[PDB]
Amino acid sequence: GLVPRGSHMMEILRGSPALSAFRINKLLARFQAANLQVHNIYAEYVHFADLNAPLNDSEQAQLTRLLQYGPALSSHTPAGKLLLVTPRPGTISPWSSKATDIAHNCGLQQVDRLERGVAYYIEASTLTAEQWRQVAAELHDRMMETVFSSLTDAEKLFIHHQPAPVSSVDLLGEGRQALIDANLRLGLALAEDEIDYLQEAFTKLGRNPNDIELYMFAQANSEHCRHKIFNADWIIDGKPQPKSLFKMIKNTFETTPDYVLSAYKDNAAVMEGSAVGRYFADHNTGRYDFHQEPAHILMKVETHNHPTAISPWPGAATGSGGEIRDEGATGRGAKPKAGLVGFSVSNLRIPGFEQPWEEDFGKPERIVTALDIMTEGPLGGAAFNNEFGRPALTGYFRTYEEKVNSHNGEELRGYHKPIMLAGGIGNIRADHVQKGEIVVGAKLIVLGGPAMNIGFASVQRDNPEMERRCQEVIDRCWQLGDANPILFIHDVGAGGLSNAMPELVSDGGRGGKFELRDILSDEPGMSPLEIWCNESQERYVLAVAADQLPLFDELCKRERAPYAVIGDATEEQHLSLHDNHFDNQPIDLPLDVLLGKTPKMTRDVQTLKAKGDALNRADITIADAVKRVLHLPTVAEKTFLVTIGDRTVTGMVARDQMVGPWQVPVADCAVTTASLDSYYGEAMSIGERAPVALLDFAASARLAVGEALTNIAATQIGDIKRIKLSANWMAAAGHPGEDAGLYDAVKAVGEELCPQLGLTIPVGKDSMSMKTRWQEGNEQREMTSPLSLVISAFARVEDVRHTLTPQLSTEDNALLLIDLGKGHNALGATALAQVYRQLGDKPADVRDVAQLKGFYDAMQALVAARKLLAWHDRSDGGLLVTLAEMAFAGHCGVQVDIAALGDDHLAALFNEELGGVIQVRAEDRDAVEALLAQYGLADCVHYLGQALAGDRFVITANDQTVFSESRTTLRVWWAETTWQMQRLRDNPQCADQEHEAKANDTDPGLNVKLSFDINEDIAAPYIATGARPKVAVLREQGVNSHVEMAAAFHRAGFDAIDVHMSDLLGGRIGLGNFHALVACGGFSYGDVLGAGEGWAKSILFNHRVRDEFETFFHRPQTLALGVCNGCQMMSNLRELIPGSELWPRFVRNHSDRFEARFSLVEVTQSPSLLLQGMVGSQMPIAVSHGEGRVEVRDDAHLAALESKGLVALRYVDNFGKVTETYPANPNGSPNGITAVTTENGRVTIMMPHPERVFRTVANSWHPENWGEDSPWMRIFRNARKQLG
Ligand SMILES: Nc1ncnc2c1ncn2[C@@H]1O[C@H](COP(=O)(O)OP(=O)(O)O)[C@@H](O)[C@H]1O
Ligand SMILES: [Mg+2]
Ligand SMILES: [Mg+2]
Ligand SMILES: [Mg+2]
Ligand SMILES: [Mg+2]
Ligand SMILES: [Mn+2]
Ligand SMILES: [Xe]
Ligand SMILES: [Xe]
Ligand SMILES: [Xe]
Ligand SMILES: [Xe]
């Protein structure tokens, strides 16, 4: 299929069927519902290659082959009306970026660009032209895609427009009116004083401004970029105030500077970490080693609220993507470690599952629903974290939408504009914490992706693999230590380059001169304004000395990170942009003019305070309340948000959300090890309580801080002054009451509580227009957010191993409540009130700052001394939920008495005051109570009773039974929300299976059987000789699990060498010098054209590297391992490997969802040399994949594979049987297959990651008796011994 396209040819190639049966049934169903009478629906990927030159037979076959991928779904002969869905013309999909990379790396330079569409074939035959538009509408996303009638209509996707010229705004010719006209025409959003400043500046300069200069200025003076509210002067109830919001936040550093290395000066904050073994490959040798040095800790938290409202997937993806850039661009280069994720939305209103507090209040047409946000956003955030390679380990998710009598009377409050929140921690070297000086003549570089027309203007675009490559360069740069060439670095975000690059020279006291046509652009029609000010993703800006440029270029080429030198730093503090194409100068400005400031804002405002009403209990019974609270999404099980995101990459994850044998997602905070050779680490927690702010601003803010503290407290940290906070403020500024509440709330934490507790807030952010207006009848409606403080806490951890969870034990035990509420038992703005459509009266609050600190200190004392069996704090859903979730995590019963807690049982069970339940050994109860009394806690400590074996959740009040149910019943109710979300988002069959397994109380949870001694280092005689065989640790662009793979081979006595595919293509390395090869995990080319395919095919279609791999595998004494992406790649090179004739392929999981699980496997009999001695063993292992379903050609292949004895690992359920039920088997592989070997055992591929869990501390659940090494260490030691 080959056609003309301007001065290019366009090829059209068939692809594979695009829809699984269940996806088809969903479409047919939606069609029946909208009363469209569609008889049948079929879809098929189709691919469009824009060629700059012709392809020969050989190359034509190669391209065709590249585009045969995916599940082998049942194919069909097209019938009915064709509707072709493609990206919007003038847009380039991420798929296209990555697939085009692969063509290039397979030596197909003739391919200018590849793009994909989906051809739908609809048989209805009944429909009107209007109804076909309704069909067309179901089949695509209005914001990213369009629908065409013809395969040849795709030629619009590749039109090249002539570069548009710069456009001047005629101030000198029209006066002020021209600036007014441009302010509306270009949507610049300028204030009148901003327009005056510009009129004057350009009038002084004596010439007309260019559109680009105005646009740059407007986006730098947005509330988003300038933060005027946060620096404003205040008058509140007629009294001027001495400090701005920012000043009140800095107060916390002024009063608590301890441990902080950088604050308010950079893209992230930095605090002291620990001296540990930092593991990476030297520039010199390419050998990986430990570098004993300080690994200091950075932190940042960002939001992406507006874009998530319009296009939730890319909005959430880029929210995280931008924040990862911030982290990497801290100092002179740093390394992201773990992530966090947050969502706030209006009511879900799940079809079929509507809850008694949900009311449809309508919404704007321009925005998506709450349910669409929670279906697509989390997938997008996960897309970035998974494809980039950072584990997501903590998060919140709240739903709120209600008509409530709050500070400005009866109003709608909620999150029609949602919160989407992404943050993380990273590590940084001491000597890179400070930004270097920008030397005059410094080259100014853009690192990363090409410019496209992105910042419809709120629909973002993510390419995480691009950012990954960029990060490898940054890692190459900090790993050079004091030879790091990065003088200064900054992320590119709002305002794109028009903000980032003046920001950069300015921070350095320099100017720059720039050349527009040096910037990498994929859209040649862009105006200069568009090149300079677009908000395209995956870009950094930096300065490097001219003489380091040859180093920076070797680094980038080898990682295949694109970059451009676009200008020079000048002594003179001027900004210039030249254009070689139009031989002119779009920007010619002094910086003090460009960055000059209009007067600061003054806000002169007044307090509103809701009275709010006492809770009406007419319809409330304790039993009906328990059922309702557990069906509040805020309370309810969060699995749909957790298993979609990787939790194990880096091999440093110690505590993830999943807890215990039953992997229940209730961990109160995240923890990571500092290195792969220490038990020191880092921790993260979140606290958050917005609804309280509808009654009381300050209390909500204090509660957010306190809850972060209670969520982190059972971690071994020590001094509270180690705990550092991000404060992210969401508000409806201007909405009556909100501004005074904002001031009061910032003061409450900045001026008071945080200083009193010794808590620093060294980073933060604000998002100041959390409101939505639209027309419903011909009446206007507003949905206004509560003031929403989200606190994230971060800390150096002293000992990762001493972390407690909510997992109860049934040994002889005592359950003690710490009620920091002190009997107040407030019910206002609780889960309980919400769920009976009320706000209620008095909310919770920090009641006693000294006791709050006493609590933290006591907990630390008990954690260090090992005096606790379990911990869970009280938050949403109260003590009731706290106890229920512990019982869930411990798979046991609870027997408690709440008589000492008041006569008001409702209020005792459902208040959301601070505190928690501790479990201790019965024999320690007195000593623990005595210690808590020593820190002043006596009167709020209450003995409750005990955890017991069994399924009874029982609550008494001396002789009366308050509440009594099956723990399992409660646990299933608590799961219904995630079940319903999984059911409508994923393969329903899988969601139901997962849900239904939870109802079987007999589930023994994860358990282990070992055929060998986990502590016996069978490699030690060999290590002891000092002879260290090399292992080729092989990575392709996009690979992300290589450091921990290398660390595992290293512990077994290997010299791990960093072999990038570019090293093999450039002849710098040759497999002929190795006896051992490992292909690592990740998302090479973002899995595009099928996970592992581009990697493998770039090997195959380069005949010289192809031969290198064939020769290796054909030698008699070589060994190879392929894990995950590497398992996939190797399965796609089968032709090079002897004894692999029967091997399967690996394709989309049956669930149709990325599965990040801790899965139980067994070791099966096979020739596998790496699995020697382990056969019969049953242990859990890290699973992180979207495309691991084993697929065979037919039953004959499967039988043949099986009878040859090549299957090496299988998934089993917790009862220990081979299973295809989900998630025990996360991907749907036949016979539970997840590893296979060759006839001679010398090559083995597996989908799970043993390299992520070779340390016991990096197993989510593990038996108490295991030492440093897990069972999976034996794989690597088997390799060592086998080489001999
Ligand atoms: N949006 C999210 N993404 C990832 N994990 C989340 C998210 N929301 C909640 N979680 C995780 O689910 C578990 C339960 O969350 P939640 O009940 O909100 O925690 P808590 O009540 O302790 O503040 C926690 O381990 C939390 O980190
Ligand atoms: Mg100190
Ligand atoms: Mg909770
Ligand atoms: Mg908690
Ligand atoms: Mg919380
Ligand atoms: Mn009191
Ligand atoms: Xe300007
Ligand atoms: Xe962490
Ligand atoms: Xe104790
Ligand atoms: Xe290996």
> Are the C-beta atoms of 902 and 822 separated by less than 8 Å?
no
CA separation for the pair 367, 261 (Å, rounded):
41
* The residue to which tokens 């030629």 are assigned: 155
The H or E element containing residue 372 is helix 370-388
> Are the C-beta atoms of 441 and 722 separated by less than 8 Å?
no
Residues 189 and 229 in one domain: no
Tell me 607's DSSP state. Answer: -
Full strand arrangement of the beta sheet holding 1030-1035: 1055-1060, 1030-1035, 1076-1079, 1119-1123, 1243-1246, 1233-1237, 1207-1211, 1155-1163, 1178-1185
**Dihedral (C-alpha) 1164, 1167, 1168, 1172: value to the nearest 10 degrees?**
70
Q: Is the CB of 343 under 6 A from ligand 1?
A: yes
CA separation for the pair 963, 948 (Å, rounded):
16
* The residue to which tokens 């905070």 are assigned: 669
Cα–Cα distances in angstroms (integers) from residue 1154 to residues 987, 991, 1130, 1148, in the given order: 12, 13, 21, 9
Task: Kindly tell me the number of DSSP H helices and DSSP E strands found in the chain.
Answer: 39, 52
> Are the C-beta atoms of 632 and 876 separated by less than 8 Å?
yes
Going by alpha carbons, the residue nearest to atom 6 of ligand 1 is 395
Count other C-beta atoms under 10 Å from residue 763's C-beta: 28
CA separation for the pair 1123, 1039 (Å, rounded):
11
CA separation for the pair 735, 787 (Å, rounded):
10
State the distance between the two ends of the chain, measured CA to CA, in whole angstroms. 55
- What sign results for the dihedral spanned by CA atoms 1250, 1251, 1257, 1261? negative
CA separation for the pair 378, 364 (Å, rounded):
22
- What sign results for the dihedral spanned by CA atoms 1170, 1124, 1223, 885? positive
CA separation for the pair 1251, 1260 (Å, rounded):
14
CA separation for the pair 788, 415 (Å, rounded):
10
Which residue, of 127, 160, 193, is where some domain finishes?
160
Q: Is 1059 helix (H, G, I), strand (E, B) or coil?
A: strand
User: Which CATH number does the domain housing residue 977 bear?
Assistant: 3.40.50.880
Binding-site residues, ligand 8, Cβ < 6 A: 338, 393, 425, 670-672, 682-684
Strands 392-399 and 335-345: parallel
CA separation for the pair 1079, 1036 (Å, rounded):
9
Closest ligand by atom to 1277 CA? 10
CA separation for the pair 549, 979 (Å, rounded):
54
Q: Is 106 a catalytic residue?
A: no
On the 0-12 / 13-18 / 19+ scale of CB atoms within 10 A, 230 is buried
Residues 179 and 92 in one domain: no
Residues 51 and 199 in one domain: no
Q: How many residues does the chain have?
A: 1284
**Dihedral (C-alpha) 961, 963, 969, 970: value to the nearest 10 degrees?**
-140
Count other C-beta atoms under 10 Å from residue 12's C-beta: 16
Residues 131 and 213 in one domain: no
Tell me 1009's DSSP state. Answer: B
Binding-site residues, ligand 9, Cβ < 6 A: 867, 927-928, 931
CA separation for the pair 684, 705 (Å, rounded):
13
Q: Is 1171 helix (H, G, I), strand (E, B) or coil?
A: helix
Q: Is 324 known as a binding-site position?
A: yes
Structure tokens at 196: 């005056």
Helices 464-478, 312-328: crossing angle, 10 deg rounding: 10
CA separation for the pair 1095, 1105 (Å, rounded):
12
CA separation for the pair 725, 813 (Å, rounded):
34
Structure tokens at 422: 């992404």
Q: Is 390 known as a binding-site position?
A: no
Closest CA to 499 of 527, 539, 545, 460: 539
Catalytic residue among 965, 1036, 1162, 1251: 1251
Residues 231 and 217 in one domain: no
CA separation for the pair 371, 934 (Å, rounded):
49
Q: Is 394 known as a binding-site position?
A: yes
Count other C-beta atoms under 10 Å from residue 926's C-beta: 11
Cα–Cα distances in angstroms (integers) from residue 987 to residues 23, 124, 644, 684, 980, in the given order: 8, 26, 14, 32, 11
Closest ligand by atom to 669 CA? 1
* The residue to which tokens 């004091």 are assigned: 482
CA separation for the pair 810, 667 (Å, rounded):
19
b/e per residue 959-991 (b: at least 16 CB within 10 A):
eeebbebebbebbbbbbbbbbbbbbbbbbbebb
Residues 210 and 103 in one domain: no
Closest CA to 1213 of 1222, 1201, 1204: 1222
Structure tokens at 905: 């049982």
> 1242 C-alpha to center of ligand 10: Å?
8
Structure tokens at 89: 């013309």
> Are the C-beta atoms of 698 and 745 separated by less than 8 Å?
yes
Which H, E and C letters describe 652-671, residue by residue? CEEECCEECCCCEECCCCEE
Cα–Cα distances in angstroms (integers) from residue 981 to residues 397, 572, 637, 995, 1121, in the given order: 13, 58, 11, 11, 37
Q: Is 200 known as a binding-site position?
A: no
Helices 622-629, 878-890: crossing angle, 10 deg rounding: 60
CA separation for the pair 677, 1257 (Å, rounded):
11
Q: Is 844 helix (H, G, I), strand (E, B) or coil?
A: coil
Going by alpha carbons, the residue nearest to atom 1 of ligand 10 is 1120
The H or E element containing residue 544 is strand 539-544
Which residue, of 913, 940, 966, is where some domain finishes?
966
CA separation for the pair 636, 1066 (Å, rounded):
53
Which residue, of 222, 241, 262, is where some domain finishes?
222
Cα–Cα distances in angstroms (integers) from residue 805 to residues 159, 714, 904, in the given order: 58, 8, 29
Q: Is 354 a catalytic residue?
A: no
Q: Near ion ligand 4, which residues have CB within 5 Å?
A: 668, 711, 873, 875
> 198 C-alpha to center of ligand 7: Å?
6
Q: Is 1159 helix (H, G, I), strand (E, B) or coil?
A: strand
Residues 648 and 678 in one domain: yes
Residues 918 and 977 in one domain: no
Residues 52 and 75 in one domain: yes
The amino acid occupying position 573 is: Q
Closest CA to 1185 of 1150, 1214, 1160, 1219: 1150
Structure tokens at 110: 């003739």
Q: Is 1249 a catalytic residue?
A: yes
CA separation for the pair 975, 1051 (Å, rounded):
41
> Are the C-beta atoms of 963 and 622 separated by less than 8 Å?
yes
CA separation for the pair 192, 213 (Å, rounded):
18
On the 0-12 / 13-18 / 19+ scale of CB atoms within 10 A, 1015 is exposed
CA separation for the pair 637, 667 (Å, rounded):
11
Q: Is 697 left (phi over 0), alpha (psi -120 to 50) or beta?
A: alpha
CA separation for the pair 1283, 1120 (Å, rounded):
12
Q: Is the CB of 805 under 6 A from ligand 1?
A: no
> Are the C-beta atoms of 242 and 232 separated by less than 8 Å?
no
Q: What is the residue range of 133's domain? A: 1-160
The H or E element containing residue 335 is strand 335-345
On the 0-12 / 13-18 / 19+ scale of CB atoms within 10 A, 548 is buried
Residues 1018 and 952 in one domain: no
> Are the C-beta atoms of 1133 and 623 separated by less than 8 Å?
no
CA separation for the pair 693, 703 (Å, rounded):
10
**Those residues with Cβ within 8 angstroms of residue 667's Cβ, 6 or more apart along the chain or in another chain:** 394, 655, 656, 657, 658, 659, 805, 806
Structure tokens at 1277: 């030691």
CA separation for the pair 57, 62 (Å, rounded):
9
> 852 C-alpha to center of ligand 8: Å?
23
Q: Is the CB of 421 under 6 A from ligand 1?
A: no
Closest CA to 784 of 725, 714, 732: 732
Q: Is the CB of 488 under 6 A from ligand 7?
A: no
> Are the C-beta atoms of 813 and 896 separated by less than 8 Å?
no
> 295 C-alpha to center of ligand 8: Å?
14
**Those residues with Cβ within 8 angstroms of residue 474's Cβ, 6 or more apart along the chain or in another chain:** 328, 329, 333, 334, 335, 447, 486, 489, 540
Going by alpha carbons, the residue nearest to atom 5 of ligand 1 is 395
> Are the C-beta atoms of 463 and 448 separated by less than 8 Å?
no
Query: 511 - beta bridge partners?
Result: 570
Residues 135 and 267 in one domain: no
> Are the C-beta atoms of 967 and 907 separated by less than 8 Å?
no
Q: How many separate domains does the chain show?
A: 4
Structure tokens at 509: 């006291």
Q: Is 667 known as a binding-site position?
A: yes
Concatenate the DSSP letters of all residues of 1209-1250 into one string: EEEB-TTS-B--STTTSSS--GGGEEEEE-TTSSEEEESSBG
Strands 813-819 and 941-948: antiparallel
Backbone angles phi, psi at 1145, to 5 degrees: -105, 170
Helices 192-205, 211-220: crossing angle, 10 deg rounding: 140
Locate all alpha helices (DSSP H) within 431-491, ordered by sequence: 464-478
Strands 584-590 and 511-515: unpaired
Closest CA to 1245 of 1077, 1087, 1115: 1077
User: Which CATH number does the domain housing residue 213 bear?
Assistant: 1.10.8.750
CA separation for the pair 582, 526 (Å, rounded):
13
Long-range residue pairs from 201-205, CB within 8 A, at least 24 positions apart, any chain:
201/593, 201/596, 202/171, 203/171, 205/593
* The residue to which tokens 């039109």 are assigned: 159
Locate all alpha helices (DSSP H) within 1052-1092, ordered by sequence: 1061-1065
Q: Is 985 left (phi over 0), alpha (psi -120 to 50) or beta?
A: alpha
> Are the C-beta atoms of 822 and 939 separated by less than 8 Å?
yes
Q: Is 575 helix (H, G, I), strand (E, B) or coil?
A: strand
> Are the C-beta atoms of 514 and 567 separated by less than 8 Å?
yes
CA separation for the pair 345, 352 (Å, rounded):
19
User: Which residue of 396, 659, 663 sits with most ligand 1 atoms within 8 Å of its CB, as the best mutation to test the pocket?
Assistant: 396
Q: Is 536 known as a binding-site position?
A: no
Residues 782 and 826 in one domain: yes
Catalytic residue among 995, 1124, 1162, 1185: 1124
